[PDB]
Design a protein around this ligand. Sequence first.
Ligand SMILES: *[C@@H]1O[C@H](CO)[C@@H](O[C@@H]2O[C@H](CO)[C@@H](O[C@@H]3O[C@H](CO[C@H]4O[C@H](CO)[C@@H](O)[C@H](O)[C@@H]4O)[C@@H](O)[C@H](O)[C@@H]3O)[C@H](O)[C@H]2NC(C)=O)[C@H](O)[C@H]1NC(C)=O
Ligand SMILES: Cn1c(=O)oc2cc(-n3cc(C(=O)O)c(=O)n([C@@H]4CCc5c4cccc5C(F)(F)F)c3=O)ccc21
Ligand SMILES: *[C@@H]1O[C@H](CO)[C@@H](O[C@@H]2O[C@H](CO)[C@@H](O)[C@H](O)[C@H]2NC(C)=O)[C@H](O)[C@H]1NC(C)=O
Ligand SMILES: [Zn+2]
Length: 215
Amino acid sequence: IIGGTECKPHSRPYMAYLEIVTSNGPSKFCGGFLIRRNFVLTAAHCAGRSITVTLGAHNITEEEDTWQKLEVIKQFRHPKYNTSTLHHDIMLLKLKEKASLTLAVGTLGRMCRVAGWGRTGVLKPGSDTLQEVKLRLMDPQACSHFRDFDHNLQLCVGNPRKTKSAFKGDSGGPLLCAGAAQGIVSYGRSDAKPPAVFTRISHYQPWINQILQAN
Ligand SMILES: *[C@@H]1O[C@H](CO)[C@@H](O[C@@H]2O[C@H](CO)[C@@H](O[C@@H]3O[C@H](CO[C@H]4O[C@H](CO)[C@@H](O)[C@H](O)[C@@H]4O)[C@@H](O)[C@H](O)[C@@H]3O)[C@H](O)[C@H]2NC(C)=O)[C@H](O)[C@H]1NC(C)=O
Ligand SMILES: Cn1c(=O)oc2cc(-n3cc(C(=O)O)c(=O)n([C@@H]4CCc5c4cccc5C(F)(F)F)c3=O)ccc21
Ligand SMILES: *[C@@H]1O[C@H](CO)[C@@H](O[C@@H]2O[C@H](CO)[C@@H](O)[C@H](O)[C@H]2NC(C)=O)[C@H](O)[C@H]1NC(C)=O
Ligand SMILES: [Zn+2]
């Protein structure tokens, strides 16, 4: 998160920190959010050979009693997900058991908010602490330069006149508008110039329901 503020610890109790394993590279990291006690919603580009979720985290470097580290048994990447265009950049992770409900862990033109542990600048490392930023929802024309952006599938997020932005490491995290999840962090420019592209959750709600009911 570029240009944001440190979250009040545990104030976003649905946030999930994902550590993703690849067979031929070191670990990668993404965000996500708990939508049922045994399901996390994230971006399809955060798929890997295996994933661990950490719920209850603020400072991700320091283990505390709020932490619940949970195994993912199965990854449900959207069947139409496209690795080039990042169309249908959405994925459900089924956890091995249901999370415990605690104060720190629970399920979940206008201004919206996004949180994550991603980098705080192009050249900066990932944040130790959960950060949050308020971003403007833009008209789709603002995202035209992303040649494969589609207004029906995706939100266009972040006033280009501000530096404020989600960035590397924030992928998979939710965008909340009036407290309801409306987007998933998907992609943007390497130079962090807003706006960025988010998955439009509303479009995928039938598919979300289909996975949950079968699992
Ligand atoms: C992920 O999305 C990719 C981008 O849309 C998919 O690649 C596209 O797949 C379609 C088939 O579904 C191909 O459609 C064909 O296009 C040719 C014309 O190709 C030439 O012209 C375009 C520019 O107009 C250029 O981009 C191409 O490279 C070629 O020079 C038609 O003659 C065919 O009838 C048909 O419509 C696209 O060409 C193709 N685009 C690219 C850039 O590869 C990809 O298949 C998706 N992957 C998955 C697994 O879903
Ligand atoms: C499909 N697509 C597209 O049209 O433009 C594309 C950009 C990329 N692409 C490339 C990067 C690079 O080259 O280093 C790069 O760093 N990032 C990071 C990763 C997440 C992110 C980046 C930058 C700005 C904002 C965000 C986000 F968090 F808001 F999503 C990136 O998304 C990934 C596919 C696309
Ligand atoms: C997050 O937790 C880590 C681990 O406790 C903190 O890291 C320490 O930071 C101080 C300086 O601020 C260093 O001198 C220590 O060596 C660090 N310890 C380790 C083991 O890395 C970090 O400050 C915390 N971050 C916050 C709260 O922003
Ligand atoms: Zn705590």
